[PDB]
Amino acid sequence: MAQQSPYSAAMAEQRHQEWLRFVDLLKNAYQNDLHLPLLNLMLTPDEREALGTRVRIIEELLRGEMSQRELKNELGAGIATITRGSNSLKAAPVELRQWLEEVLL
Amino acid sequence: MAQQSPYSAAMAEQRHQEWLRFVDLLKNAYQNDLHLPLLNLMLTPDEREALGTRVRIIEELLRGEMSQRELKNELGAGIATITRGSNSLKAAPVELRQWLEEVLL
């Protein structure tokens, strides 16, 4: 099978453990109301600003997709209503259709 | 007083709100067991690795300071014990000092 040298396996295992220890360290900082000073210790001012900007970009990407999905579903529902209205008019009883023309003058 | 243009005040207020929204977004992700995929969305693999490495550097800096503080307190306690032992020997009754020399042969 696709294996790897014991050097690369140790580097990947240390990299994994170091990342898990960061996530757990920040989790306990949130539970002790100490996440704000820890983030200032872990991140430079430019890196914190980059993270805030990335949150805005994600919001702008999600809202752009949502409005695009709503526009697609609105046009599809509008077409579905026209086709369903046409079929319902052709399937309607003649008494109803005869009366609908009289209201149209 | 030291004020600032309304442009810079708006940029600083947006920067502040964007950072607060990131901290709150990650806090709710920890409470929903969704912090791991959110961090992968917010951070590239190199940036996550850098954060794990920074946690190890902080541990190595703190342990280096702790062992240096323990070495300083041990040497100070050792000197304090010698000076306190010397004073206690000179303040001891003569009956005790006379007997301590006899045990020394």
Residue numbers in the entry:
A (entry chain A), B (entry chain A): 1 to 105
Give the exact sentences the study uses for this entry.
Tryptophan repressor (TrpR) was one of the earliest gene-regulatory proteins for which a high-resolution crystal structure was determined in complex with its DNA regulatory site. The TrpR dimer is formed from deeply intertwined monomers and is related to domain-swapped proteins, even though it does not meet a proposed definition predicated on the existence of a stably folded monomeric structure, which TrpR apparently does not have. Formation of the extended domain-swapped structure depends on the conversion of two interhelical turns in each subunit of native dimeric TrpR into helical segments, resulting in the formation of a continuous, nearly straight α-helix of 47 residues. TrpR crystals in the typical native dimeric form have previously been reported for a variant in which Val58 is replaced by isoleucine (Val58Ile), one of 19 TrpR mutants created by Arvidson et al. to explore the role of the identity of the residue at position 58, which forms part of the l-Trp-binding site.
Hereafter, the Val58Ile TrpR protein after protease cleavage is referred to as cleaved. The structures of free and l-Trp-soaked cleaved Val58Ile ds-TrpR were determined to 2.05 and 2.45 Å resolution, respectively, and refined to an R work/R free of 26.8/29.9% and 27.8/29.1%, respectively. A clear example of this effect is illustrated by the common observation of components of crystallization solvents in seemingly well localized sites on protein surfaces, as for iPrOH in the l-Trp site of the l-Trp-free ds-TrpR structure here, which has a B factor similar to those of its surrounding residues, as does l-Trp in the l-Trp-soaked structure. The structures of cleaved Val58Ile ds-TrpR with and without soaked l-Trp have only minor differences in overall structure (r.m.s.d. of 0.56 Å for all non-H protein atoms). The results presented here demonstrate that the structure of domain-swapped Val58Ile TrpR is also essentially identical to that of wild-type ds-TrpR.
